[PDB]
Structure 1
Amino acid sequence: QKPAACRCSRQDPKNRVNCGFPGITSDQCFTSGCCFDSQVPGVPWCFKPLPAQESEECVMQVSARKNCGYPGISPEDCAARNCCFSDTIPEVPWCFFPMSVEDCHY
């Protein structure tokens, strides 16, 4: 299934992880759960989407996270402060500010 827009557009083209086989079409790429973009040269055209989050406002590259909490903040407290919580990647804030989706596109 085609991934939500932010899982595709919020990635730096140079950080793209290739998805599918050589020559996979735009439709096949989307159908496979990947993102397709034929506009940037020299980078994968069919690529893996960013991990899905609780909401699409919480989708962004790990390096774009703005710390909305503190060391040891709980998921619930983070949710109270109106933020996104994700503790699966090292060195990055686990509680972070979400970003409205107007920038997202295919």
Structure 2
Amino acid sequence: QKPAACRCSRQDPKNRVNCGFPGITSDQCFTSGCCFDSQVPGVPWCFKPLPAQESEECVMQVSARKNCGYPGISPEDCAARNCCFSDTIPEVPWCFFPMSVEDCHY
């Protein structure tokens, strides 16, 4: 169902991964659980969204993560400094700064 904007907004157009069959409409794309955008040329207009998070300020591409914790920092201690926490991808910052959800459009 319509992924929230930052899951869409926050991806680099060159890293979009196709979603939907070809000629799928805005609505079918969004309701397929993907992102529609018809303003950037040359890239998929119906693409898969970023993995969600509890807060949308924490949603970005793994590479845009700036470290905010330290090896082993607890999810509780990571929250105390008002940082995001995500232990799903290995070998990247599990505690990183969030980014103000505002750049986030469709």
TM-score (norm 1): 0.95
Hey, what does 1:24 align to over in structure 2? Answer: 24
Structure 1, unmatched stretches of 5+, are none
- In structure 2, the partner of 1:48 is 48
Partners of 1:22 and 1:7 in 2: how far apart?
Answer: 21
Q: 2:92 & 2:42 partners in 1: Cα distance? A: 28
- The 2-side partners of 1:79 and 1:18 are apart by 34
- For the residues of structure 2 that align with 1:102 and 1:41, how far apart are their CA atoms? 23
Please list the CA deviations of residues 24-60 of structure 1 after superposition, one character each: whole Å capped at 9, or x if unmatched: 0011101111000111122111011101101000001
Percent identity, aligned pairs only, is: 100
Q: Secondary structure of the residue that 2:102 maps to in structure 1?
A: helix
Is the deviation greater in 55-64 or in 86-95?
Answer: 86-95
CA RMSD of aligned residues (A): 0.9
Q: TM-score, normalised by structure 2?
A: 0.95
Deviation at 1:91, TM superposition (A): 2.7
Structure 1 consecutive aligned stretches of length 4 or more whose deviation exceeds 4 Å: none
Deviation by residue 1:44-90 (Cα, 9 ceiling, x = unmatched): 11011101101000001111111111011111111122111012113
* Structure 2 spans left out of the alignment, 5+ residues: none
- Judge which range, 51-60 or 74-83, deviates more: 74-83
